Amino acid sequence: MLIAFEGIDGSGKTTQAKKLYEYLKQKGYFVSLYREPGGTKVGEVLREILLTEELDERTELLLFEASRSKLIEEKIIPDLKRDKVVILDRFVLSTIAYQGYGKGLDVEFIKNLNEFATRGVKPDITLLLDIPVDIALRRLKEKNRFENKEFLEKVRKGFLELAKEEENVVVIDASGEEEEVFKEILRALSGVLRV
Amino acid sequence: MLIAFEGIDGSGKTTQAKKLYEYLKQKGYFVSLYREPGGTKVGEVLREILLTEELDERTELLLFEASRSKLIEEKIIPDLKRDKVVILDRFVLSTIAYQGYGKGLDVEFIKNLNEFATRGVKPDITLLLDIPVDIALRRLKEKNRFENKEFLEKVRKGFLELAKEEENVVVIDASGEEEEVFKEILRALSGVLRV
Numbered sequence: 001m002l003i004a005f006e007g008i009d010g011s012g013k014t015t016q017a018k019k020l021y022e023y024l025k026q027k028g029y030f031v032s033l034y035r036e037p038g039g040t041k042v043g044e045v046l047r048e049i050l051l052t053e054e055l056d057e058r059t060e061l062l063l064f065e066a067s068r069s070k071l072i073e074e075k076i077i078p079d080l081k082r083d084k085v086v087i088l089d090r091f092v093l094s095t096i097a098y099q100g101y102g103k104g105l106d107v108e109f110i111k112n113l114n115e116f117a118t119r120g121v122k123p124d125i126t127l128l129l130d131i132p133v134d135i136a137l138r139r140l141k142e143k144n145r146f147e148n149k150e151f152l153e154k155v156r157k158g159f160l161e162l163a164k165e166e167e168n169v170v171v172i173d174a175s176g177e178e179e180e181v182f183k184e185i186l187r188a189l190s191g192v193l194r195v
Numbered sequence: 196m197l198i199a200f201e202g203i204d205g206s207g208k209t210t211q212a213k214k215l216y217e218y219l220k221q222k223g224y225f226v227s228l229y230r231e232p233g234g235t236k237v238g239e240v241l242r243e244i245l246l247t248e249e250l251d252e253r254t255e256l257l258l259f260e261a262s263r264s265k266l267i268e269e270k271i272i273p274d275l276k277r278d279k280v281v282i283l284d285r286f287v288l289s290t291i292a293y294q295g296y297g298k299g300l301d302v303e304f305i306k307n308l309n310e311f312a313t314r315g316v317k318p319d320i321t322l323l324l325d326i327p328v329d330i331a332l333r334r335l336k337e338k339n340r341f342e343n344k345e346f347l348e349k350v351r352k353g354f355l356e357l358a359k360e361e362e363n364v365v366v367i368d369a370s371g372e373e374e375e376v377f378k379e380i381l382r383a384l385s386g387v388l389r390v
Contacts, residue, residue: 144295144302146360 001193002080002121004091007129007159008152009145010136011174012181016129017089019182020189027195029085032075036090037067040074057103061113064095069117076121085193092118093126093162093169101158102151125192127185128163129174130156196388197275197316199286202324202354203347204340205331206369207376211324212284214377215384219280222390227274230284232262235269252298256305259290264312271316280388287313288321288357288364296353297346320387322380323358324369325351363387 003020005013014035021033038047046067050060079086092114100107133152140147163169170188174181186195198215200208209230216228233242241262245255274281287309295302328347335342358364365383369376384390 141303142301144299146302 001083001085002076002088002123003085003189004088004093004123004126005129006091006093006097006126006169007131007174008097008133008136008156009147010138010140011129011131012139012178013129014089015178016127016174016182016185017087019178020185021087023186024085024087024193030082031085031087032079033087033089034071034075036071036088036094037064039067039071042070043067057099057105061095061099061105061110064099065113065117068092068095068114072118072121077119080121088123091123091126093128093159096162097155097158101161102155123168125189126169127188128159128169128171129181130160130163130171131174132156135175196319197271197281197283198384198388199283199288199318199321200324201286201288201292201321201364202326202369203292203328203331203351204342205333205335206324206326207334207373208324209284210373211322211369211377211380212282214373215380216282218377218381219282219390224390225277225279226282227270227279228282228284229266229270231266231286231289232259234262234266237265238262241265252294252300256290256294256300256308259294260308260312263287263290263309267313267316272314275316283318286318286321288323288354288361291357292350292353296356297350318363320384321361321364322383323354323364323366324376325355325358325366326369327351330370 005017007013017033021031024031037050038044046063049055050063050067055063076086095114096107096110099105100110133149133156136152137147137149160171163171170191172181172184172188176184189195200212202208212228212230216226219226231238232245233239241258244250245258245262250258271281290309291302291305294300295305328344328351331347332342332344355366358366367376367379367383371379381390
């Protein structure tokens with residue numbers, strides 16, 4: 001069982017992912033929660049580089065994938081083997097939406113690169129937290145984060161197109177309040193998990 | 196015109212601001228140098244409060260802003276009208292980096308409050324003296340004053356985040372020696388002030 005949250009910054013991926021983690025453990029499941037990039041010793045150091053160093057979009061993409069690669073081989077695959085419910089804050093769709101639709105890199109090449117890093121491991125379900133950029137931005141400012149509106153509009157559209165073209169993605173209206181967004185997530189999850 | 200020095204404690208703001216004051220004065224400009232908080236009679240009164248009283252972060256911000264308001268209308272605006280070169284040891288950027296990224300207050304609100312206190316008066320150029328926190332702390336320690344490392348790391352990052360989108364902000368590598376740093380400041384200044 002692999003559950004992946006996707007969506008633009010400010011969509012509430014980290015908060016909802018944590019809510020789900022606590023919720024499922026309480027129900028008796030063995031669960032893991034990882035963030036991308038990061039999640040492993042090597043992955044976290046790369047996270048630093050990515051968020052502090054001046055990088056061209058290509059080196060950036062390669063570093064995101066190397067982090068993903070390490071996380072997959074070191075923790076995700078072994079977790080799934082032990083029947084743990086793995087929850088990901090961000091995953092493959094975001095790489096495509098940001099690097100592809102946002103920065104202009106080739107989507108098929110990104111898909112091929114994602115495939116390589118994850119050894120073909122895909123989510124049983126992907127929760128796309130959709131939300132208008134303006135609301136996402138307000139929420140980010142509350143945490144003193146300021147993102148590029150123009151860039152995010154492109155990324156938002158990218159996610160929505162991806163939600164149509166591929167398997168197991170449920171679009172969640174993440175514009176509402178926390179508990180309501182979370183309840184909508186549980187309902188989408190009732191289709192793969194019994195809650 | 197107005198020149199502002201910004202940066203964490205130990206980045207050499209006071210030392211370099213004084214050096215610039217001397218250099219400009221010898222060149223023939225009529226110069227004024229003020230340090231916040233303070234600069235006025237009421238400001239000093241607020242300065243002691245800020246230094247000798249337990250205050251929540253919101254009250255602290257309002258008193259800083261009040262000292263700035265008084266200094267702006269009593270000295271700075273009149274100085275600028277008289278074509279005096281005004282040099283500031285600390286200014287609006289520091290308030291944002293410290294109270295916002297440092298203590299967690301709303302960055303957007305702080306910027307708005309900055310604007311109100313200054314009546315819109317902004318620097319022709321802002322010199323952000325960037326330096327690694329451990330180096331600044333070393334320098335502060337040799338003066339036998341100690342600052343919070345965890346806090347400054349947040350503040351330092353804050354200053355750099357601001358430097359990316361705030362107007363007329365020049366990042367000076369303040370990790371160098373005194374004369375080479377001042378040389379950099381003078382080069383940075385040549386773009387707005389033909390000394």
